[PDB]
């Protein structure tokens, strides 16, 4: 089972990715987690992402396409934050990487900033929380390791605004792209209401999947 999750910054893609991973045994391929990993470990394929991610900008198509091809070689899958541009989507289709399901998370722009201000992460695992809407079982702590949660460098309101602009400029056109793919019989397309509670979005995804 090959799945693409599509949606604005903060739509809840990674939150739902965890549930699909721990159910259908489908590995999460989070380009965002992989680039943050490669920055910390100074890795050749990604270490260059640091200033771009701090700016709220997209990393170059060719770097992430290489990153994804490499990670794919080592495996079903769930693509989370890739593709992010038409040229990334075209690269998957040119390399014959077909998917069974494309799932669009619909969340109004007006929720995103206010949403991401509450985001807390366990960097080592990529588990993510929200201080109000999906809190850890113990305030400030990872549920599994008990380690103090952190705030991502790029989750400052200014950087989120910039990320949401780049999403509408560069990424939102993938909605049309994969809808045409579904129209040609190449994949299933489904939309989920990302404003519902975490639990309901999870059940909506189980109905689709």
Numbering used by the authors: 1 to 75, 80 to 213
Excerpt from the paper describing this PDB structure:
AK plays a key role in maintaining ATP levels in cells by catalyzing the reaction ATP + AMP ⇄ ADP + ADP. It consists of three domains: the large CORE domain, the LID domain that binds ATP, and the nucleotide monophosphate (NMP)-binding domain that binds AMP. X-ray crystallographic studies showed that the LID and NMP domains undergo a major conformational rearrangement upon substrate binding. This movement, termed domain closure, forms the enzyme’s active center and helps to exclude solvent molecules that might interfere with the chemical reaction.
To probe the origins of SI further, we selected three variants of AK with similar thermal stabilities to the WT: L82V and L107I, which are more inhibited than the WT, and F86W, which is not inhibited by AMP. Further, a crystallographic study of one of the mutants also did not demonstrate a structural change that may explain the effect of AMP. In particular, we determined the crystal structure of L107I AK, which shows strong inhibition, in complex with Ap5A to a resolution of 2.05 Å. As no differences in the static structure of AK were found that could explain differences in enzymatic activity, these are more likely rooted in dynamic interactions. Contrary to this expectation, the enzyme retains significant residual activity even at high AMP concentrations, as seen particularly well for L107I. Interestingly, both closing and opening rates were accelerated in the binary AK-AMP complex. This effect was particularly substantial for L107I and L82V. A C50 value of 2,568 ± 820 μM was found for the WT, with significantly lower values (~500 μM) for L107I and L82V. Moreover, L107I was shifted further toward the closed state (64.8 ± 0.5%) than it was possible in the presence of ATP alone (55.8 ± 0.8%). Under these model assumptions, a simulation of the enzyme activity at a saturating ATP concentration (1 mM) and varying AMP concentrations was able to qualitatively reproduce the SI pattern of the WT as well as the mutants L107I and L82V. In reality, the potent inhibition observed experimentally for L107I and L82V might also be influenced by a slower transition between ETMinhO and ETMO for these mutants and also by other parameters whose accurate values cannot be determined currently.
